[PDB]
């Protein structure tokens, strides 16, 4: 229907802006495999009872077999992702998945990535692919096809330092007359992100302000928000004094904020600075704090309740 | 094994700085399949006669089949890349392959990319993966493993706008005590690349300059060049005023320059601005002008001879 409408519907459904990050590393997979075998696959057996696992399109036969040795890594990697989604999805307004974690093993991880997006799409849960794509317009069309046609993602992240015009070939497809949403990197959770995003300037404005400004110019040029799509901003949770300014200077803009949890922020200051009455425009991404926690559903609910309490106090 | 030594060794062997870009699109694959079907698989049959094709590690049971299905697209895509490598590798100092062209179909294209790097690695031809990676240090280690451990690439491209420190987790691996090379995006061939790389500045030095300096400071901090690795710059062929500034201000730097051919540059002016006696420090990337040309070897030789004349 459009990412804007889809986000706004689900926010009424579950009343949160929590964005769960699903970034499984190699140690998450082996710990999951060892724990399932020592506990008689209690989580995997629960996955196979879930409805939508019968609708994934890649190696469905292998995935539904009860515990083909070369497929062992594919099996537990994919089932670990189902486990996290099954355990925590009721608290998630959005799921964000970083492309880097699904490529380091070659094609096998892309098949897992495809199944994860198929799974979330049948749950009708909004998705974000954190791929931070950037290239010339001819080349970036390949990224658009992978993100929005193959995976059927709702959105992705973009690094427009090479030029804002790349958004014309990411957020718009003239041949299908289709519109897509994206989050451009504005201020990032790197400790040394300032050297370029702060200390560079044009007309006594810091680079992140000018980059956010240029991003919205492209958004209006492509008429995304008339098609219920948008171009948003990635603003790190630790950047409290740029967050305010983004919300103040650009009201009604969508912000994706990572850095709470594994990178050690303060949730109240982040959410209040980026707050908006439509709080789907202030997505709080929490990944490793949930996915590496021993009781993931318990962890998701903890951050779910904390976010709602800070919303009420707004 | 070091990238600096590998580049300079091969440069003496074939005496060129041509970088052949292998960016096959959807129509390159369909056209290759169509012509192979019309002409009794003459190029695919030539690919299977090569000794080194046995060195690919993914689905060799399909790749080495006589030409004959769900595996049909994978087969012709993979063989098209081998076809180009077989036709043109004698003129290439390095091969650069842009990750974007290998992902849009899902995992199948990554299998081709792996086999392509396997093929080039056994031919001992230097490789570049044009992926322009950028992320936090924890995340980018995954790119380093995919690029330098899985594909065994010699180098890749990086966008350090998120912070120079990501190079610490790309060009160096503390657990293995291994060093890798990279090319940082400095000035790009976008028509509107100026909006950020030119008009942004610190104390009236343009953003690309401060990014280039910050890139080499990181290279010196990691002691890359004593481990026969380096950090280089991506400087567009059309940017003659910055190409010359980089060559003078950073005299011994490695430069990777794309944009000649399909993006309508002038080879003489680009190469002269960035020239260095060790001309492996000025790689000229040519992609579509060769891969989309009807006679790829003839086009590669055309640019090879043209580059050699400019010296
Ligand atoms: O400025 C940014 C942009 C994106 N991410 C991504 O967000 C996720 C953070 O998850 P975690 O730190 O909660 O585990 C990772 O995928 C990371 O690459 C950041 O951490 N900071
Ligand atoms: O500033 C840049 C940086 C990288 N590339 C890459 O170089 C190749 C262009 O070669 P060609 O096919 O245009 O000849 C593509 O992979 C493209 O993504 C550019 O064209 N311009």
XYZ file of C-alpha atoms and ligand atoms in Angstrom:
667
model
C 0.000 0.000 0.000
C 3.037 2.147 0.680
C 5.594 2.071 3.475
C 4.086 5.143 5.174
C 0.628 3.544 5.425
C 2.057 0.165 6.444
C 4.106 1.716 9.251
C 1.164 3.832 10.408
C -1.232 0.868 10.518
C 1.110 -1.354 12.538
C 1.933 1.446 14.985
C -1.745 1.550 15.978
C -1.734 -2.257 16.192
C 1.088 -2.624 18.739
C 1.778 0.986 19.911
C 5.568 1.060 19.802
C 8.421 2.319 17.644
C 10.832 -0.500 18.524
C 12.891 -1.678 15.537
C 14.453 -5.087 16.159
C 17.799 -5.654 14.465
C 18.563 -9.197 13.283
C 22.335 -9.374 12.675
C 23.384 -12.988 13.330
C 27.132 -13.524 13.527
C 29.057 -16.793 13.376
C 29.018 -17.266 17.148
C 25.259 -16.739 17.348
C 24.789 -19.619 14.908
C 27.068 -22.122 16.641
C 25.729 -21.260 20.100
C 22.207 -21.727 18.755
C 23.147 -25.075 17.201
C 24.799 -26.350 20.377
C 21.925 -25.204 22.589
C 19.246 -26.786 20.386
C 21.049 -30.135 20.367
C 21.606 -30.077 24.136
C 17.942 -29.107 24.658
C 16.415 -31.467 22.043
C 15.692 -28.750 19.467
C 12.947 -27.187 21.552
C 13.065 -23.942 19.558
C 13.425 -25.582 16.127
C 10.404 -27.793 16.835
C 8.476 -24.635 17.726
C 9.562 -23.048 14.427
C 8.163 -25.907 12.350
C 4.761 -25.476 14.016
C 4.660 -21.821 12.897
C 2.382 -21.201 9.921
C 4.566 -19.159 7.574
C 7.621 -21.458 7.510
C 5.672 -23.511 4.929
C 5.818 -20.495 2.571
C 9.557 -19.832 2.286
C 10.817 -20.449 -1.228
C 14.438 -21.620 -0.803
C 15.282 -25.193 0.303
C 11.939 -25.624 2.045
C 12.540 -29.395 2.043
C 15.774 -29.106 4.034
C 14.330 -26.480 6.383
C 11.350 -28.591 7.507
C 13.294 -31.829 8.036
C 13.550 -32.873 11.656
C 17.217 -33.060 12.778
C 22.572 -33.729 4.343
C 25.545 -32.566 6.421
C 26.762 -29.836 4.045
C 23.377 -28.168 4.684
C 23.879 -28.143 8.467
C 25.096 -24.541 8.635
C 22.316 -23.334 6.333
C 19.794 -25.161 8.522
C 20.717 -23.705 11.914
C 21.490 -20.250 10.517
C 18.028 -20.001 8.951
C 16.349 -21.533 12.023
C 18.159 -19.124 14.343
C 16.600 -16.233 12.393
C 13.131 -17.802 12.552
C 13.621 -18.312 16.296
C 14.344 -14.611 16.889
C 11.429 -13.482 14.721
C 9.067 -16.026 16.284
C 10.169 -15.135 19.816
C 10.185 -11.344 19.471
C 8.035 -10.240 16.516
C 5.026 -9.257 18.643
C 7.005 -6.290 20.049
C 8.530 -5.107 16.761
C 7.168 -2.249 14.703
C 9.965 -2.992 12.208
C 12.737 -5.502 11.581
C 16.084 -4.215 10.291
C 18.680 -6.605 8.889
C 22.206 -5.594 8.005
C 23.379 -7.075 4.713
C 26.943 -7.527 5.974
C 26.026 -10.411 8.285
C 24.440 -12.445 5.472
C 27.229 -12.216 2.850
C 30.451 -13.381 4.624
C 29.831 -17.082 3.843
C 28.961 -16.628 0.169
C 25.644 -17.501 -1.426
C 24.349 -19.625 1.487
C 23.718 -16.512 3.592
C 21.833 -14.765 0.788
C 19.435 -17.741 0.696
C 18.941 -17.266 4.438
C 18.446 -13.536 3.870
C 15.839 -14.232 1.176
C 13.939 -16.609 3.462
C 14.027 -14.067 6.297
C 12.446 -11.376 4.120
C 9.894 -13.869 2.771
C 9.053 -14.806 6.370
C 8.635 -11.213 7.549
C 6.585 -10.354 4.446
C 4.054 -13.099 5.169
C 3.805 -11.725 8.702
C 3.197 -8.319 7.057
C 5.889 -6.810 9.296
C 7.749 -3.736 7.962
C 11.333 -4.416 6.907
C 14.593 -2.491 6.531
C 17.693 -3.808 4.775
C 20.726 -2.051 6.248
C 22.993 -2.203 3.192
C 24.152 1.461 2.971
C 24.235 1.259 -0.816
C 26.120 3.782 -2.916
C 27.235 3.891 -6.566
C 26.547 5.525 -9.938
C 22.975 5.536 -11.191
C 23.392 2.786 -13.770
C 24.956 0.465 -11.187
C 22.621 1.272 -8.273
C 19.670 -0.050 -10.286
C 21.037 -3.520 -9.464
C 20.759 -2.738 -5.756
C 17.188 -1.545 -6.263
C 16.243 -4.821 -7.956
C 17.816 -6.931 -5.202
C 16.321 -4.924 -2.325
C 12.813 -4.166 -3.568
C 12.081 -6.848 -6.189
C 13.914 -9.965 -4.996
C 13.708 -9.486 -1.224
C 10.567 -7.304 -1.438
C 11.944 -5.116 1.333
C 9.974 -2.069 2.409
C 13.091 0.111 2.675
C 16.877 0.226 2.823
C 19.700 2.508 3.943
C 21.741 4.684 1.577
C 25.055 6.565 1.726
C 24.627 9.530 -0.627
C 28.138 10.960 -0.224
C 28.790 10.096 -3.885
C 25.787 12.205 -4.895
C 22.101 12.608 -4.128
C 21.078 11.743 -7.717
C 21.603 8.042 -6.951
C 18.300 8.212 -5.048
C 16.480 8.642 -8.364
C 17.501 5.086 -9.308
C 16.924 3.632 -5.813
C 13.634 5.172 -4.677
C 12.046 5.216 -8.143
C 11.741 2.775 -11.056
C 10.486 4.544 -14.163
C 9.893 1.317 -16.094
C 7.447 -0.023 -13.476
C 6.401 3.419 -12.144
C 7.027 2.183 -8.600
C 8.194 4.151 -5.573
C 10.381 3.002 -2.680
C 11.567 4.392 0.649
C 15.099 4.747 1.989
C 17.089 6.094 4.936
C 20.127 8.176 4.112
C 23.115 8.215 6.435
C 23.116 11.591 8.219
C 24.910 11.194 11.551
C 26.336 7.799 12.456
C 27.259 6.006 15.678
C 30.940 5.770 14.747
C 33.146 7.383 17.409
C 34.998 9.302 14.671
C 32.027 10.041 12.403
C 32.477 13.761 13.108
C 35.622 14.238 10.980
C 33.410 14.405 7.862
C 29.815 14.794 9.071
C 30.705 17.612 11.527
C 33.967 19.294 10.527
C 33.077 19.597 6.825
C 30.824 22.542 6.059
C 29.056 24.568 3.367
C 27.767 28.090 4.146
C 28.506 27.632 7.881
C 26.282 24.534 8.045
C 27.679 21.177 9.104
C 27.819 18.443 6.471
C 25.112 16.268 8.035
C 22.655 19.174 7.904
C 23.418 19.855 4.236
C 23.223 16.146 3.411
C 19.836 15.848 5.123
C 18.712 19.027 3.351
C 19.771 17.697 -0.062
C 18.074 14.357 0.651
C 14.675 16.001 1.128
C 15.132 18.033 -2.053
C 15.429 14.750 -3.958
C 12.459 13.314 -2.060
C 10.180 16.115 -3.265
C 11.587 15.964 -6.805
C 10.597 12.296 -7.073
C 7.248 12.967 -5.354
C 7.751 10.019 -2.992
C 5.481 11.223 -0.188
C 2.562 11.626 -2.587
C 3.037 7.892 -3.250
C 3.219 7.023 0.489
C 7.002 6.569 0.346
C 9.732 8.716 1.851
C 13.412 9.460 2.235
C 14.418 9.403 5.892
C 17.483 9.974 8.036
C 19.775 7.598 9.920
C 20.691 9.470 13.112
C 22.800 7.770 15.752
C 21.301 7.427 19.212
C 24.393 8.933 20.871
C 24.099 12.138 18.771
C 21.619 13.908 21.049
C 22.358 17.475 19.888
C 22.021 16.676 16.183
C 18.834 14.622 16.736
C 16.932 17.579 18.239
C 18.096 19.806 15.379
C 16.885 17.279 12.799
C 13.481 17.002 14.477
C 13.303 20.777 14.937
C 14.516 21.973 11.524
C 12.810 19.100 9.632
C 9.548 18.264 11.403
C 7.627 15.207 10.199
C 10.793 13.517 8.886
C 11.357 9.793 9.416
C 14.394 8.912 11.547
C 16.037 5.508 11.978
C 18.192 5.518 15.104
C 20.606 2.700 15.967
C 23.142 2.603 18.804
C 20.954 1.783 21.823
C 22.072 -1.343 23.616
C 25.305 -2.755 22.217
C 26.813 0.730 21.816
C 25.639 1.948 25.210
C 23.202 4.873 24.937
C 20.480 6.407 27.115
C 17.053 5.533 25.742
C 15.116 8.453 27.272
C 17.284 11.199 25.785
C 17.217 9.640 22.311
C 13.465 9.032 22.145
C 12.477 12.429 23.554
C 14.775 14.355 21.189
C 13.575 12.499 18.126
C 9.984 12.234 19.330
C 7.046 12.892 17.017
C 3.335 12.331 17.595
C 3.563 9.738 14.808
C 6.393 7.933 16.563
C 6.974 5.561 13.638
C 9.179 8.489 12.523
C 11.541 7.737 15.430
C 12.479 4.071 15.063
C 14.691 2.830 17.895
C 16.827 -0.020 16.607
C 17.946 -2.586 19.162
C 19.871 -5.582 17.871
C 22.593 -7.381 19.819
C 21.037 -6.405 23.167
C 18.094 -8.624 22.150
C 19.515 -11.233 19.760
C 22.491 -12.130 21.981
C 20.404 -12.088 25.164
C 19.717 -15.595 26.562
C 15.921 -15.003 26.698
C 15.145 -12.959 23.560
C 11.394 -12.573 24.089
C 12.135 -11.370 27.615
C 14.633 -8.840 26.232
C 12.285 -7.580 23.520
C 9.480 -6.987 26.017
C 11.832 -5.139 28.371
C 12.769 -2.628 25.672
C 9.154 -2.588 24.450
C 7.820 -1.463 27.835
C 10.622 1.078 28.298
C 9.846 2.703 24.944
C 6.113 2.941 25.700
C 6.751 4.580 29.091
C 8.920 7.241 27.444
C 6.247 7.766 24.792
C 3.566 8.343 27.440
C 5.822 10.892 29.171
C 5.741 12.816 25.870
C 51.605 -12.452 -1.983
C 51.512 -8.757 -1.099
C 49.381 -6.625 -3.391
C 52.169 -4.116 -4.063
C 54.539 -6.906 -5.105
C 51.844 -8.658 -7.144
C 50.974 -5.473 -9.057
C 54.576 -4.532 -9.826
C 55.545 -8.076 -10.847
C 52.687 -8.349 -13.339
C 53.269 -4.802 -14.569
C 56.784 -5.757 -15.715
C 55.375 -8.884 -17.392
C 52.776 -7.117 -19.573
C 53.775 -3.417 -19.257
C 50.381 -1.776 -18.881
C 48.086 -0.202 -16.295
C 44.801 -1.267 -17.900
C 42.132 -2.396 -15.441
C 39.439 -4.418 -17.193
C 36.060 -4.013 -15.524
C 33.805 -7.060 -15.512
C 30.276 -5.799 -14.754
C 27.899 -8.130 -16.625
C 24.287 -6.958 -16.723
C 21.050 -8.817 -17.475
C 21.280 -8.150 -21.226
C 24.935 -9.177 -21.443
C 23.945 -12.620 -20.146
C 20.878 -13.033 -22.372
C 22.792 -11.870 -25.455
C 25.685 -14.234 -24.703
C 23.281 -17.151 -24.309
C 21.434 -16.228 -27.506
C 24.617 -16.098 -29.596
C 25.974 -19.318 -28.081
C 22.730 -21.097 -28.975
C 22.817 -19.783 -32.557
C 26.466 -20.740 -33.111
C 26.821 -24.198 -31.515
C 28.357 -22.995 -28.225
C 31.694 -22.006 -29.748
C 32.746 -19.754 -26.854
C 31.437 -22.043 -24.106
C 33.292 -24.938 -25.745
C 36.466 -22.836 -25.752
C 35.994 -22.113 -22.038
C 35.845 -25.814 -21.156
C 39.135 -26.459 -22.974
C 41.017 -24.151 -20.597
C 42.969 -25.984 -17.913
C 42.245 -23.505 -15.122
C 38.422 -23.785 -15.302
C 38.789 -26.814 -13.005
C 39.899 -24.452 -10.210
C 36.415 -23.028 -9.569
C 34.870 -24.294 -6.340
C 31.107 -23.826 -6.838
C 28.843 -26.183 -8.799
C 31.617 -27.418 -11.080
C 29.294 -30.349 -11.888
C 27.132 -27.802 -13.742
C 29.819 -25.513 -15.172
C 31.786 -28.305 -16.866
C 28.728 -29.951 -18.455
C 28.485 -29.852 -22.212
C 25.983 -27.098 -23.086
C 22.427 -28.280 -22.434
C 16.576 -26.052 -16.532
C 16.861 -24.049 -13.305
C 20.668 -24.103 -13.694
C 20.536 -22.541 -17.173
C 20.923 -18.908 -16.075
C 23.770 -19.704 -13.665
C 25.560 -21.597 -16.448
C 25.536 -18.858 -19.099
C 26.190 -16.060 -16.590
C 29.261 -17.861 -15.243
C 30.527 -18.807 -18.712
C 30.114 -15.252 -20.004
C 32.529 -14.024 -17.319
C 35.039 -16.766 -18.162
C 34.626 -15.897 -21.846
C 35.613 -12.269 -21.155
C 38.516 -13.277 -18.899
C 39.821 -15.777 -21.455
C 39.532 -13.239 -24.292
C 41.045 -10.221 -22.548
C 43.249 -11.279 -19.624
C 46.507 -10.998 -21.600
C 46.062 -7.198 -21.773
C 44.874 -6.656 -18.180
C 47.091 -5.601 -15.300
C 44.106 -6.052 -12.978
C 40.448 -7.075 -13.044
C 37.854 -5.063 -11.120
C 34.414 -6.525 -10.498
C 31.561 -4.502 -9.058
C 29.590 -6.436 -6.445
C 26.329 -4.769 -7.475
C 26.058 -6.754 -10.709
C 26.337 -10.112 -8.913
C 23.657 -9.645 -6.208
C 20.383 -8.639 -7.982
C 19.303 -12.268 -8.642
C 19.992 -13.555 -5.135
C 22.549 -16.176 -4.205
C 23.060 -17.502 -7.760
C 25.123 -14.459 -8.771
C 27.297 -14.711 -5.666
C 28.158 -18.252 -6.778
C 29.285 -16.767 -10.091
C 31.298 -14.094 -8.281
C 33.068 -16.711 -6.161
C 33.928 -18.788 -9.241
C 35.147 -15.656 -11.050
C 37.557 -14.780 -8.239
C 38.610 -18.440 -7.995
C 39.342 -18.375 -11.727
C 41.278 -15.102 -11.577
C 43.176 -16.164 -8.446
C 44.493 -19.330 -10.125
C 45.489 -17.269 -13.158
C 47.304 -15.132 -10.557
C 45.720 -11.958 -11.952
C 45.265 -9.081 -9.460
C 41.672 -8.445 -8.430
C 39.578 -5.546 -7.138
C 36.069 -5.920 -5.727
C 34.232 -2.636 -6.297
C 31.820 -2.908 -3.370
C 32.327 0.512 -1.642
C 31.810 -0.978 1.797
C 30.981 1.239 4.763
C 29.672 0.464 8.253
C 30.719 0.331 11.904
C 33.840 -1.624 12.795
C 31.962 -4.604 14.215
C 29.900 -4.968 11.044
C 32.605 -4.276 8.432
C 34.653 -7.248 9.672
C 32.056 -9.341 7.836
C 32.921 -7.523 4.601
C 36.625 -8.113 5.239
C 35.971 -11.836 5.668
C 33.794 -12.019 2.544
C 36.220 -9.992 0.422
C 39.679 -11.160 1.479
C 39.033 -14.604 2.981
C 36.104 -16.012 0.988
C 36.814 -14.456 -2.432
C 40.566 -14.066 -1.751
C 40.435 -10.655 -3.409
C 43.569 -8.537 -3.570
C 41.699 -5.283 -2.836
C 38.336 -3.546 -2.609
C 36.834 -0.049 -2.574
C 35.648 1.750 0.568
C 33.484 4.800 1.349
C 34.947 6.233 4.550
C 32.366 9.004 4.958
C 31.128 7.218 8.106
C 34.633 7.436 9.595
C 38.219 6.594 8.698
C 38.520 4.051 11.528
C 36.592 1.459 9.498
C 39.841 0.996 7.557
C 41.309 -0.514 10.744
C 38.825 -3.390 10.440
C 39.097 -3.726 6.647
C 42.813 -3.482 5.847
C 44.040 -5.318 8.959
C 43.002 -8.511 10.743
C 44.419 -8.750 14.264
C 43.426 -12.400 14.732
C 45.376 -13.575 11.662
C 48.054 -10.838 11.529
C 47.206 -10.224 7.867
C 47.083 -6.980 5.881
C 44.882 -6.096 2.913
C 44.722 -3.247 0.406
C 41.871 -0.883 -0.405
C 40.922 2.098 -2.570
C 38.988 4.873 -0.846
C 36.418 6.919 -2.743
C 37.901 10.405 -3.165
C 36.434 11.879 -6.351
C 33.723 10.027 -8.268
C 32.341 10.076 -11.816
C 28.816 11.084 -10.765
C 27.604 14.216 -12.579
C 26.563 15.651 -9.183
C 29.529 14.327 -7.172
C 30.550 17.947 -6.527
C 27.680 18.668 -4.114
C 29.554 16.902 -1.290
C 33.122 16.115 -2.379
C 33.801 19.626 -3.749
C 31.514 22.186 -2.099
C 32.004 20.805 1.410
C 35.239 22.029 2.940
C 37.229 22.471 6.139
C 39.333 25.645 6.294
C 38.986 26.039 2.507
C 40.303 22.567 1.676
C 37.726 20.565 -0.237
C 36.185 17.446 1.269
C 37.895 15.059 -1.148
C 41.305 16.447 -0.128
C 40.717 16.018 3.594
C 39.274 12.556 2.934
C 42.364 11.609 0.911
C 44.739 12.827 3.638
C 42.700 11.093 6.332
C 42.889 7.918 4.227
C 46.690 7.998 3.991
C 47.100 8.854 7.677
C 45.219 5.638 8.369
C 47.496 3.785 5.949
C 50.592 5.056 7.750
C 49.045 4.298 11.143
C 48.507 0.658 10.112
C 51.997 0.284 8.578
C 50.435 -1.107 5.406
C 53.200 -0.326 2.930
C 55.835 -2.252 4.901
C 53.495 -5.273 4.685
C 53.270 -4.766 0.891
C 49.692 -3.441 1.044
C 48.365 0.087 0.566
C 45.368 2.401 0.740
C 44.574 4.110 -2.552
C 42.165 6.633 -4.024
C 39.278 6.327 -6.471
C 39.590 9.416 -8.691
C 37.225 9.788 -11.619
C 38.727 10.077 -15.081
C 36.711 13.234 -15.758
C 38.179 15.013 -12.686
C 41.386 16.327 -14.233
C 41.852 19.178 -11.750
C 41.701 16.826 -8.765
C 43.620 14.046 -10.501
C 46.584 16.396 -10.902
C 46.273 17.768 -7.364
C 46.351 14.226 -5.960
C 49.356 13.138 -8.042
C 51.427 16.145 -6.952
C 50.332 16.491 -3.305
C 50.413 12.676 -2.820
C 53.196 11.696 -5.256
C 53.616 7.953 -4.511
C 49.917 7.146 -4.057
C 48.056 4.375 -5.864
C 45.169 5.736 -7.950
C 42.229 3.818 -9.429
C 40.457 5.809 -12.139
C 37.144 4.727 -13.734
C 34.910 6.575 -16.205
C 36.732 6.295 -19.553
C 34.703 4.733 -22.342
C 31.059 4.331 -21.362
C 31.191 7.655 -19.484
C 32.942 9.457 -22.361
C 36.300 10.656 -21.034
C 39.629 11.486 -22.658
C 42.234 8.842 -21.945
C 45.290 10.968 -22.747
C 44.417 13.787 -20.335
C 43.385 11.416 -17.525
C 46.487 9.212 -17.740
C 48.917 12.127 -18.078
C 47.507 13.937 -15.028
C 47.899 10.870 -12.801
C 51.044 9.457 -14.417
C 53.717 7.749 -12.333
C 56.817 5.817 -13.388
C 55.338 2.873 -11.476
C 52.221 3.184 -13.567
C 50.457 0.445 -11.597
C 49.752 3.434 -9.326
C 47.414 4.769 -12.042
C 44.944 2.003 -12.910
C 42.684 2.888 -15.843
C 39.389 1.013 -15.528
C 37.596 0.153 -18.773
C 34.435 -1.895 -18.449
C 31.466 -1.571 -20.786
C 33.660 -0.329 -23.660
C 35.224 -3.823 -23.657
C 32.564 -6.165 -22.263
C 29.715 -4.747 -24.373
C 31.918 -4.480 -27.466
C 31.220 -7.140 -30.139
C 34.918 -8.166 -30.186
C 36.130 -7.959 -26.565
C 39.742 -8.975 -27.221
C 40.045 -6.444 -30.043
C 38.654 -3.681 -27.811
C 40.989 -4.643 -24.967
C 43.966 -4.597 -27.336
C 42.799 -1.225 -28.681
C 42.893 0.348 -25.217
C 46.033 -1.622 -24.309
C 47.961 -0.251 -27.287
C 46.425 3.189 -26.750
C 47.584 3.205 -23.111
C 51.088 2.004 -24.017
C 51.453 4.796 -26.578
C 50.802 7.372 -23.827
C 54.295 6.845 -22.352
O 25.121 4.830 12.086
C 24.855 3.670 12.090
C 24.176 3.057 10.914
C 23.835 1.595 10.924
N 24.171 0.767 12.064
C 23.808 -0.656 12.019
O 22.804 -0.883 12.993
C 23.027 -2.165 13.637
C 23.252 -1.944 15.113
O 22.850 -3.078 15.875
P 23.328 -3.261 17.384
O 24.440 -2.294 17.586
O 22.150 -2.872 18.279
O 23.616 -4.728 17.583
C 24.185 -2.821 12.890
O 23.668 -3.588 11.804
C 24.951 -1.619 12.350
O 25.777 -1.883 11.230
C 24.852 1.377 13.266
O 25.142 0.701 14.262
N 25.194 2.855 13.252
O 33.371 7.189 -9.432
C 33.185 6.079 -9.802
C 33.481 4.934 -8.895
C 33.248 3.524 -9.365
N 32.735 3.277 -10.696
C 32.530 1.884 -11.113
O 33.360 1.629 -12.238
C 32.618 0.867 -13.229
C 32.404 1.729 -14.447
O 33.011 1.163 -15.600
P 32.333 1.307 -17.032
O 31.529 0.055 -17.252
O 31.632 2.613 -17.006
O 33.450 1.376 -18.072
C 31.339 0.423 -12.535
O 31.583 -0.782 -11.810
C 31.099 1.563 -11.557
O 30.267 1.236 -10.467
C 32.436 4.438 -11.625
O 32.001 4.270 -12.771
N 32.672 5.856 -11.149
